[PDB]
Design a protein around this nucleic acid. Structure first.
Lengths: 208, 138, 99, 150, 124
RNA sequence: GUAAACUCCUGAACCCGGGACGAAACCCCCGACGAGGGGACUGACGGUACCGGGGUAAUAGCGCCGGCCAACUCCGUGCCAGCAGCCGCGGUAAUACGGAGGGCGCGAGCGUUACCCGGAUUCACUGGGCGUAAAGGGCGUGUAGGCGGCCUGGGGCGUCCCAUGUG
RNA sequence: GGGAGCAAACCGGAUUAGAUACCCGGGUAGUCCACGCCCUAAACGAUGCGCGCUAGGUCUCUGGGUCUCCUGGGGGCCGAAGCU
C-alpha cells in the first residue's frame, strides 16, 4: 500500500498543489510551478467539460492522496462516519486526522505525512508513555504524543522541530516544543481545517 | 347506495373546492359533524350548519379559499390542497399512538376515530391513544 | 391455561361427539384487510345433550381419542340453522366443483 | 449574475427534400445558491446561441425557494406528464442525492441536504419541469397559517 | 386489482431461468471436444469465428467460443468452459478458457493477459 | 519526470542476549476433613509472543482508457485477423482489433465465471395499470364470498391504552 | 320439408407472361321452415356493474305541468374545471 513512486506528479494532475513532498512541493518547484498541467503525452491540451462523475471522483482522490491512504482504508473510515451521528463530513475528517501518522505531521515532528509514517512504524513515536508503531492508530482526547527516548537524539527530529518553534498548531492540538511531547486536545471541528476539498462531493461520490 | 359516506363527504369537499364553490351541502351524520367540527377548528373551513332539503337533513359546508393572485390564472390558491380517505371500507387501517403519522411534516393533519371521539395527529399523540386512521388533510 | 373457543354445532351425528365450527378474525399480514378463517373441532358431548345449531364454548382438554382434544363447556345459545346453512351450502356447492 | 449551470444539450432533426436540418436545445438552470433559481429551455440553430438563449428564458422564469439551513421544509411528490419526482427533507451532513438534472437545480437553489427519487419517466426535460413545479408548491408554517386564518 | 383480489389471488413472483446450464449451479465445467469448426457471424458482420462442440461432464454438449487468434485444439481436446454468449454466433453460449488442459494460451500476447491465459514474460 | 543516477538517514528481514501471562486449585500443614489461615507440584503452544543490543535499501502485480465509465497518441492490420456486458467496432488514414508510448482505477492482489439482493414503482401493501400501447369477461341470471343509508341503547370480538409474564 | 332469387365449390368465356383471381355466361351445397346440435367474432363504444359528486351551449325522441315555459327518462353534437 502507501502509494510509492512519483509524487509532486499528484501535487499535479489534481492541479491543486499537494504538499506531498514536504519542503520541495514548497520551493519554487513542486514541479507544480514549472509544469502546471496533467502528466504524460497530452497534459497541455483543450481540457474538456468533466462529467459530474469525473468531478466527484477527482475530489475524493484528491482528499485521499493528501493522507496517502489505501482506498480500502479510506473507504472504511467513510462508512464509520456514515453510520455515526454528527455531520458525516466533519466526523470523517476528524477520524482521518485522528490517525497517528497524521498527528505526527500536524504536530510537526515530521515534514511530510509519508515521512511521518516511517517514523511511526520505526517506534520513534510514543503514546502516553508506551511506544507505538501503527500508522492507523486513532488518537483520543488527552493523549501525550511524545518521542521515544532512543529517537530524541536524531538530526531529522531536531530540524523538523526547529522550524516549529514559535509556529502554530491546530486549535485542537498542543505541543511541548522543548520536550517533544504534545497532546491531542479534542476532535477537530470542520472549520479548524483548511484542505482544498469540497468534502460534500466525496460524500456524493460514495452514494453511487 | 353509497358504500362509504365519509369518503364521499371528503370528495364532495374536494369537488366543491375545485370550482371555488361558496358553500356545499352533504347529507348529515353525527360522525360527519364530528369530522367537520375538526375541519373548521383546524382552519380548513369557515364552518358548517345543519340545514333542510325536502325534509332531509344536510350540512351546508362553508368553504374557505386563498386570496386572489396576479399573473395569468388569478385563481386563489387553496386552503385544502389535498384531502384523501385512508382507512377505506375494504382496506381498514388502525394504528397505536406510537405508529401515528406526521402529515406534511406537520403542516397538514391526520384525523382519526378513537375510543375517545375523533382526534388529530397531535391531540391523540398527546392524549396517548390510537384508532382508525380516517384521512389526511392539507 | 386451557384455551377456550366459541362455535356452532354443525354435526351431531356421532355417538357422544359433536362438530363445532369456529371462525376467527385477524388482519391480513400484508394487505391489512381483516379476514375470517374457520376450523371444525370434534368435541366431547358425553350426554348427547347438545343438538344441532347450538352455539357453544369448547375447552382444551387431554386427548379423548384421535382427533378429539376438546370438551363442550356450556351452551351460549340455541338453534342457529342459518349459520349451518352457510356451512352446508358452501359445502353443498363443492358438489358443483368436480370434473 | 447567477451561478448558471447547463444540464443537457441536444441536436434535434427535421426533414426536407434535401436532407435533415438540425436545431439545438439547451436546458439550463440558473441560480444564486440563496433560494432563487429558474429553469430556461432555449432552442436555436446553433449551440452557443441556444444556451445563451436558455439563460434569457431562465431568468425570465424563476422561483423563490423556502429553506431551512439548506433543505426543503416538507415532502412533495410532483407528476409532470408521465415523469414523477419525490422531494423529502434531510439533516445536515447528508448532501444532494439525485441525478444530474434535479441535482443541478437544487444545488443552485442553495440546498445542501435533501433526498430524491425519480419515479415514472426519467425524461430529463420533463423531470426538470416537474421539479420546478414542485418547488412552486413549497410552504413554511408562515404560508400555512396565513392561509388558515378565518 | 382490488385488495380483496390480492387476498385470494396474491401477487405472482417471476423467478429467472439461467442463461447458462453448466448445471449444478456451477461456475465452471470440464469438457471434451467433438468438433473444432470455423463458423460464420450473424447480421452486419463477416468473419470466421473459431468454435467447438464439447462433451461436458454434465452429459450435455454444446458449442463454445474459442477466443484469441490462433488455437491448438483437435478432435479430442480436454477443455474448460466459462459461460458468456457471443452476440454474433447465435447459440454459442459458453467460452472456452485458454491456458487450461489441452487449451493452450495465446502466444506472443502481452496486453490483456490474464484473460487469454498467458504467463508473464520476461522479455530480456 | 524528481522519476532515475547521485547525497546523506531510517532500518523489514537476518543476527546476539534475556524470556512469560495463561497456573492455582485438587494435594501437604494449623483450624474441625467445615468457614478461615498458611505451604508445595504442574505448560502442549515454546525458548514462541514480548523486552533489550546489534543491523542490510530491501517483492509489484492485475484490469481498463468509443459511450455508459475516470483514463489519447503513433504503428500494424484492411468486414481479414479479431473485440463484445448492452448500443456497437473492423471494407487502407480505427481513440473500439494487435503491439507500443502515455494515462485512469485498485493494490498482495487484480480480473473472469457462477449464484443471491439491488438498481426493477419490471407482480406495484408501502408503490403500476387495462378507449388506440400488453390488459373489460360476447351478454345476462344468480351461489359462495366481499362490501353496507340515518338514529338509540345492550355487549365489547375487531380496535386503542395500562400493568405484568415471556420474548 | 322447401328451393324463385342469389351463390362458395365446380365449369365455361374473357383478360394476362401466367390468372387455380379481379369482369362475363352457368351452377351445387347453402340461403328459407321445423326440430336438435355447434358457442365463435373487428360479439367494438376495441370503454365490466351499481352509487354519489363536478359550467353550460346547441337539436332530437319520449312522458308529466294552473303548458312564451318548467320538470323526468333516452339518443347526438360543441365544450368549464379536471384528466390524457
Amino acid at each position: 500500500g502507501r502509494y510509492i513512486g512519483p509524487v509532486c506528479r499528484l501535487c499535479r494532475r489534481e492541479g491543486v498543489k499537494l504538499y506531498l513532498k514536504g519542503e520541495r512541493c514548497y520551493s519554487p518547484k513542486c514541479a507544480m510551478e514549472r509544469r502546471p498541467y496533467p502528466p504524460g503525452q497530452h497534459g497541455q491540451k483543450r481540457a474538456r467539460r468533466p462529467s459530474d462523475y469525473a468531478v466527484r471522483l477527482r475530489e475524493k482522490q484528491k482528499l485521499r492522496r493528501i493522507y496517502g491512504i489505501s482506498e480500502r482504508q479510506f473507504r472504511n473510515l467513510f462508512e464509520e462516519a456514515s453510520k455515526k451521528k454528527g455531520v458525516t463530513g466533519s466526523v470523517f475528517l476528524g477520524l482521518l486526522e485522528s490517525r497517528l501518522d497524521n498527528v505526527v505531521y500536524r504536530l510537526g515532528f515530521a515534514v511530510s505525512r509519508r515521512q511521518a509514517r516511517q517514523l511511526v512504524r520505526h517506534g520513534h513515536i510514543t503514546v502516553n508513555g508506551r511506544r507505538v508503531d501503527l500508522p492507523s492508530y486513532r488518537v483520543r482526547p488527552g493523549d501525550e504524543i511524545a518521542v521515544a527516548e532512543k529517537s530524541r537524539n536524531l538530526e531529522l527530529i531536531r530540524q523538523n522541530l526547529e522550524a516549529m518553534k514559535g509556529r502554530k498548531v491546530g486549535p485542537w492540538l498542543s505541543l511541548d516544543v522543548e520536550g517533544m511531547k504534545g497532546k491531542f486536545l479534542r476532535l477537530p471541528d470542520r472549520e479548524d481545517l483548511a484542505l482544498p476539498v469540497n468534502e460534500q462531493l466525496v460524500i456524493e461520490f460514495y452514494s453511487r | 347506495m353509497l358504500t362509504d359516506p365519509i369518503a364521499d363527504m371528503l370528495t364532495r369537499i374536494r369537488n366543491a373546492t375545485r370550482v371555488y364553490k361558496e358553500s356545499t351541502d352533504v347529507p348529515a351524520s353525527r360522525f360527519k359533524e364530528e369530522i367537520l367540527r375538526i375541519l373548521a377548528r383546524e382552519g380548513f373551513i369557515k364552518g358548517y350548519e345543519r340545514v333542510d332539503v325536502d325534509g332531509k337533513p344536510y350540512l351546508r359546508v362553508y368553504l374557505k379559499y386563498g386570496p386572489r393572485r396576479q399573473g395569468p390564472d388569478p385563481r386563489p390558491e387553496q386552503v385544502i390542497h389535498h384531502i384523501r380517505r385512508i382507512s377505506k371500507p375494504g382496506r381498514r387501517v388502525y394504528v397505536g399512538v406510537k405508529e401515528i403519522p406526521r402529515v406534511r411534516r406537520g403542516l397538514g393533519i391526520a384525523i382519526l376515530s378513537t375510543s375517545k371521539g375523533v382526534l388529530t395527529d397531535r391531540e391523540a399523540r398527546k392524549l396517548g391513544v390510537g384508532g382508525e386512521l380516517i384521512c389526511e388533510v392539507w | 391455561p386451557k384455551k377456550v373457543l366459541t362455535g356452532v354445532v354443525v354435526s351431531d351425528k356421532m355417538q357422544k361427539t359433536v362438530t363445532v365450527l369456529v371462525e376467527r378474525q385477524f388482519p391480513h399480514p400484508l394487505y391489512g384487510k381483516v379476514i375470517k378463517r374457520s376450523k371444525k373441532y370434534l368435541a366431547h358431548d358425553p350426554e348427547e345433550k347438545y343438538k344441532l345449531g347450538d352455539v357453544v364454548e369448547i375447552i382444551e382438554s387431554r386427548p379423548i381419542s384421535k382427533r378429539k382434544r376438546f370438551r363442550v363447556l356450556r351452551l351460549v345459545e340455541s338453534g342457529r340453522m342459518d349459520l349451518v346453512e352457510k356451512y352446508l351450502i358452501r359445502r353443498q356447492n363443492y358438489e358443483s366443483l368436480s370434473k | 449574475d447567477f451561478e448558471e449551470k447547463m444540464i443537457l444539450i441536444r441536436r434535434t432533426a427535421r426533414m426536407q427534400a434535401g436532407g435533415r436540418r438540425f436545431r439545438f436545445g439547451a436546458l439550463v438552470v440558473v441560480g444564486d445558491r440563496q433560494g432563487r433559481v429558474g429553469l430556461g429551455f432555449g432552442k436555436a440553430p446553433e449551440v452557443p446561441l441556444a444556451v445563451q438563449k436558455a439563460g434569457y428564458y431562465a431568468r425570465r422564469n424563476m422561483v423563490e425557494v423556502p429553506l431551512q439551513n439548506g433543505t426543503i421544509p416538507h415532502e412533495i411528490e410532483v407528476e409532470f406528464g408521465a415523469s414523477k419526482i419525490v422531494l423529502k427533507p434531510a439533516a445536515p451532513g447528508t448532501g444532494v442525492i439525485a441525478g444530474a438534472v434535479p441535482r443541478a437545480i437544487l444545488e443552485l437553489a442553495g440546498v445542501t441536504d435533501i433526498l430524491t427519487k425519480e419515479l415514472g419517466s426519467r425524461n430529463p426535460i420533463n423531470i426538470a419541469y416537474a421539479t420546478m413545479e414542485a418547488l412552486r408548491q413549497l410552504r413554511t408554517k408562515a404560508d400555512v397559517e396565513r392561509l388558515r386564518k378565518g | 386489482p382490488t385488495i380483496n383480489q390480492l387476498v385470494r389471488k396474491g401477487r405472482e413472483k417471476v423467478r429467472k431461468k439461467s442463461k447458462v446450464p453448466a448445471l449444478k449451479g456451477a461456475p465452471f465445467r470440464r469438457g471434451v471436444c467433438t468438433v473444432v469448426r470455423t463458423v460464420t457471424p450473424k447480421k452486419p458482420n463477416s468473419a470466421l469465428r473459431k468454435v467447438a462442440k464439447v462433451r461436458l461432464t454434465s452429459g450435455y454438449e454444446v458449442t463454445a467460443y474459442i477466443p484469441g487468434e490462433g488455437h491448438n485444439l483437435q478432435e479430442h481436446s480436454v477443455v474448460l468452459i466459462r459461460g458468456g454468449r457471443v452476440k454474433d454466433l447465435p447459440g454459442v453460449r459458453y467460452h472456452i478458457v485458454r491456458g487450461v488442459y489441452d487449451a493452450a494460451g495465446v502466444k506472443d500476447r502481452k496486453k490483456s493477459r490474464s484473460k487469454y491465459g498467458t504467463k508473464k514474460p520476461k522479455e530480456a
